[PDB]
Paper text:
[name]-[name]-2 is a positive-strand RNA virus. The core component of this complex is the catalytic subunit ([name]) of an RNA-dependent RNA polymerase ([name]).
The structure of the template-[name] [name] complex contains one [name], one [name], and one [name]. Extensive protein-RNA interactions are observed between the template-[name] RNA and [name], with a total of 41 residues from [name] directly participating in RNA binding (within 4.0 Å of RNA, 26 residues to the template strand and 15 residues to the [name] strand). Despite the presence of excess [name] in complex assembly, only a single RMP is assembled into the [name] strand, as observed in the structure. Near the bound RMP are two magnesium ions and a pyrophosphate.
Residue numbers in the entry:
A (entry chain A): 31 to 50, 84 to 100, 118 to 895, 911 to 929
B (entry chain B): 78 to 191
C (entry chain C): 2 to 64
The structure:
Amino acid sequence: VYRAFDIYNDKVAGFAKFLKETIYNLLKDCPAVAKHDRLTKYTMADLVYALRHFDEGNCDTLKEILVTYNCCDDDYFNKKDWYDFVENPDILRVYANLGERVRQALLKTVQFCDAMRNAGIVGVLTLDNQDLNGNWYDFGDFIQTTPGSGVPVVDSYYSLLMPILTLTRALTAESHVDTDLTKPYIKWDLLKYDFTEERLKLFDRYFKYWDQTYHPNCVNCLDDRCILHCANFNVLFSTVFPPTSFGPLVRKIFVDGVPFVVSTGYHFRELGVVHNQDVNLHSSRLSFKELLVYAADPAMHAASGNLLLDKRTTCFSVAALTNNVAFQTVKPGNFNKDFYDFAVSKGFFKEGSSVELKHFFFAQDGNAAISDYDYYRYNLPTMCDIRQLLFVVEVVDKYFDCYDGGCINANQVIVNNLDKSAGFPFNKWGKARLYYDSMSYEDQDALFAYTKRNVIPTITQMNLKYAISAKNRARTVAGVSICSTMTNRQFHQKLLKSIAATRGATVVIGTSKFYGGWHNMLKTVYSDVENPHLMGWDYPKCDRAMPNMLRIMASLVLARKHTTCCSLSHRFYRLANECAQVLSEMVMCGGSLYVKPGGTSSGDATTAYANSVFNICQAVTANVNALLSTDGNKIADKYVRNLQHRLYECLYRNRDVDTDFVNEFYAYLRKHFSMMILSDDAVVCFNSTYASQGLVASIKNFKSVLYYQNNVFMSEAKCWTETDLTKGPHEFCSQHTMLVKQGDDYVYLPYPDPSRILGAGCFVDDIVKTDGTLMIERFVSLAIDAYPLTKHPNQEYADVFHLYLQYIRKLHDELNTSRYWEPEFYEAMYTPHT
Amino acid sequence: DKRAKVTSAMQTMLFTMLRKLDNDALNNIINNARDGCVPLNIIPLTTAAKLMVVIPDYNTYKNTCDGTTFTYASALWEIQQVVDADSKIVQLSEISMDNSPNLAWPLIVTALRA
Amino acid sequence: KMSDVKCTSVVLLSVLQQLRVESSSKLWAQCVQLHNDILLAKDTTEAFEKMVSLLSVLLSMQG
RNA sequence: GAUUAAGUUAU
RNA sequence: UUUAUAACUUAAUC
Ligand SMILES: *P(=O)(O)OC[C@H]1O[C@@](C#N)(c2ccc3c(N)ncnn23)[C@H](O)[C@@H]1O
Ligand SMILES: [Mg+2]
Ligand SMILES: [Mg+2]
Ligand SMILES: [Zn+2]
Ligand SMILES: [Zn+2]
């Protein structure tokens, strides 16, 4: 029978399934020791491997563990998708029944390490040596030394176990009086916000022998790796403290002798307590900059509002700013019957055609805005394997080595569009143009300098979109404050422009698909993989389910280019401002203030780039887990076996960064797992032989990683694999691919779903777009998009372009390479000479 | 100048919002704190004079706002008005199991601190 | 047949919307339900049944 | 060939 | 009352 083991020999290392002294007298008195002349079928490593390598239909060990310890019963698994966090959110209750066993295992491990310290034993703890009752039973590899000076090594044990501590909510009992679940909850003082001593007590209770220093307040951290280390612990401990203690911290201030309420700090779940450095209790007059800062600050709005109890959502309500709730609806789309009659005349929409309408404007009733916001219930506090994440961040950072960055002055910021919303409450009086014009460059620079020493919390406003789709779902967009946007541009714009200007890199944001760009992107991803297949995946609920750890990680990777301009305190306050503005800010949704649990924000300046960082992070995690879960003895290649050994050593045995191994592993991924990444979309060209042997990640490994780290189930129905490179990727950025003869050589052309273009023709979101002058331009754009359909073997697809050209002829009559009524205008858009 | 106009608008809004603040409840909360600094989330919770409840269905109604007075957040609240999603006044006698499908939902309940 | 049903349902919801039906949420919710069901349907019989049910709403008021 | 506007697509 | 980025098209102007 196969069992999970955590192995590190001179020969083999890893965490994988394998086919399976007189120092006991120095430990027999410890009540965490099993009796040796009792034990259960499964160890802690079986649970850890089952939840870290989840596969449905290959999960009988997890079923047996769940039914053995009365988490559920055998009939629970007859329900469809019993394991899915989204289709069956009750599964979290089933996993939470294991929390007490894991907490008792942690306590018994602390007792065992105390006993080893007293007895003078040196040894490495492993999960497979501990029963599911928490008893420790394997001592064969320990070493005697002077009693009272033992040294238990626990890096791998705690690091591997960490993701399960939040999935089972092991620390739930700490919310109760005397840590007993049968007694009532501890009732805290509502004014208590610090909790630093409680955090230290939790750390010493459960992680006494964790070797690295923990900072309850991340403002005391030493670098970004220390920030990640201590934020990971803060995520676990913050689940114990009351939700009302988190967020902006407020104080009474006097201006003109008149009392205001202003935020002088912030209590973060992940970063602890942060206090503002520039606070002055008495002020004679308020400048424009302080007017802006206090208008953005939610303190005034929340303090002046009514108390709100919203039962429609599971999210934490702050205050109602208006006496009446708003129930904004979504209109249906307008119909372009002039174009539909033309299309039917030319023979479309007959029965049995492969081309049919599927994209519509879907109406939404008054519950839409709050119903959509409630999908943040998929965001859950996730603890990461910290050693694995700390290696991944060094590998992920290698993908961003080629870009320049750093802070710029306000006089050189490029703002694409000034005539757009400034957010709440600034949208009440003007657009972004107003605030960019009113503030001089020195005022903008003084506002930016202020955010390097103080945290400014802001309010994000959420609005429903009006957009065509095949899905009934209503889509909302998050509008951020001008105060946050203005400083975020001055922090990030140099790097964002550098990324968007680069060609041939892994991140393909800013690359055009026109004039041969699509062909160049595919030849770049195909680069030199020698048994190539293609793969693509989807992130379910990406914008809502993203853990806060990986968003903070993505923010720190973007801020690594700020070594010469920013100090470490400046960088910490920049991160704290980013968190308080886009991670856990307050959301204005229908006139009421709510706390966003986490996840990304659509209106954030860095959203696409941060999502690209997240996608790369998840892919590197999948590759690392695939490599460490394989049987090292079965790896035929000497080089890959040595690579697996050094990878394990570099994650769990070393703590300094081994730059040479980061370079070598990055080269290995570039050689065998080359990626094309745009936000959350990805195409991978991977070595098929290595993927079949478990040497590089496959869809299985992404499924497992997304289960244990992102809290979602990725079903294979939405994933794809293509075995022939003469075919393109199946689906990338909503475009299919065809190999087309163009001139003397073959090129890859992107083409849309014909239903999408016909929907964009038939339905519009404003009646004014029926005017010929705008309608002609709109159909020129849709014909530029539809043109590659003529190369498709399916004549029903080809006729979609000719319909658009015929309609353009009709419109031009009602009203040569630049004459858009002839096909040569469109053909020129897809040829290399731009 | 737009500069002065927006300065006036921001300062007017900031000073107008103080008609509610500086109530002695706020001072009682802030002064006994060890350092005068309190979480923002507890300020409306402990000091707001009015509570708005939004109820999606009758099962949540019986569990939260049964009777003319109910308790929430360690206080007693007395119902002033109930309105539906159409902002029309709904009498307490109308809200029943048998009548419930006739009412528009959600219901918005406003209450004053006792 | 089906495409005509969908295109007619869209303009029918539009004409209901411009007659201020959405200011009565209890009826607007059912109009939206019928509209989305018609667009998501793949058989013309259910589409016709829901389309006539939706058109009855316009026929009830003065139109 | 540099700003300004409008529009389409993608995320 | 409608965010962020990227690409493209069209019309202007020195
Ligand atoms: P895609 O698969 O469409 O969505 C994933 C990812 O994209 C966003 C980004 N960036 C996104 C999609 C559509 C929009 C709009 N209209 N505005 C802003 N951002 N997006 C989201 O962040 C989402 O997570
Ligand atoms: Mg997605
Ligand atoms: Mg996509
Ligand atoms: Zn630290
Ligand atoms: Zn910088």
